[PDB]
Amino acid sequence: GSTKADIEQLPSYRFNPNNHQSEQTLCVVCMCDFESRQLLRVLPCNHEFHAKCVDKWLKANRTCPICRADASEVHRDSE
Ligand SMILES: [Zn+2]
Ligand SMILES: [Zn+2]
């Protein structure tokens, strides 16, 4: 499950093939297609992944698996 509190976790939604606006159909981390009802997380660069897959990835790497943009928080009171 999530290792962050809900209000600190990346935003997420459940995949629905009937109303899916994104160009992505594939979780590249596990190389498996998105399926209806699966929980996806979306990074600040707008790339999306299965929640379980990207959580692991970001703990180890901090960067988006696809574009390598750092998904870390931009904090008000630190650099
Ligand atoms: Zn995956
Ligand atoms: Zn990205």
Author numbering: 387 to 465
Pull text from the paper.
RING family ubiquitin ligases (E3s) employ the RING domain to recruit the E2 thioester ubiquitin (E2∼Ub) intermediate to catalyze the transfer of ubiquitin (Ub) to substrates. A cationic Arg linchpin (LP) residue in the RING domain plays a key role in stabilizing the interface with E2∼Ub, but the identity of the LP residue varies across E3s. Notably, the position of a cationic Arg residue in the RING domain is conserved in most structures of RING E3/E2∼UbD complexes, where the Arg side chain forms a network of hydrogen bonds with UbD and E2 to stabilize the closed E2∼UbD conformation. We chose the RING domain of RNF38 to use as a model monomeric RING with a native LPArg.
RNF38RING has been crystallized in complex with UBE2D2−Ub previously, yet no high-resolution crystal structure exists of the RNF38RING in isolation. To establish whether Arg454, the native LP residue in RNF38, is constrained by other residues in the absence of E2∼Ub, we determined the structure of RNF38RING to 1.2 Å. RNF38RING adopts a similar structure to that seen in the RNF38RING-UBE2D2–Ub complex (r.m.s. deviation of 0.58 Å for 64 Cα atoms). The location of LPArg within the RNF38 RING domain remains unchanged, with its side chain adopting a slightly different orientation, most likely as a consequence of crystal packing. The observed electron density is well defined in the region, and the conformation of Arg454 is clear, with a B-factor of 17.5 Å2 compared with the overall average B-factor of 18.9 Å2. Briefly, the structure of RNF38 comprises a three-stranded β-sheet, sandwiched between a β-loop–β-motif and an α-helix. All RING domains have a set of conserved Cys and His residues that coordinate two structural Zn2+ ions. In addition, there are differences in the C-terminal tail, which facilitates E2 binding in the complex structures, and is not involved in any interactions outside those of crystal packing in the structure of the RING domain alone.
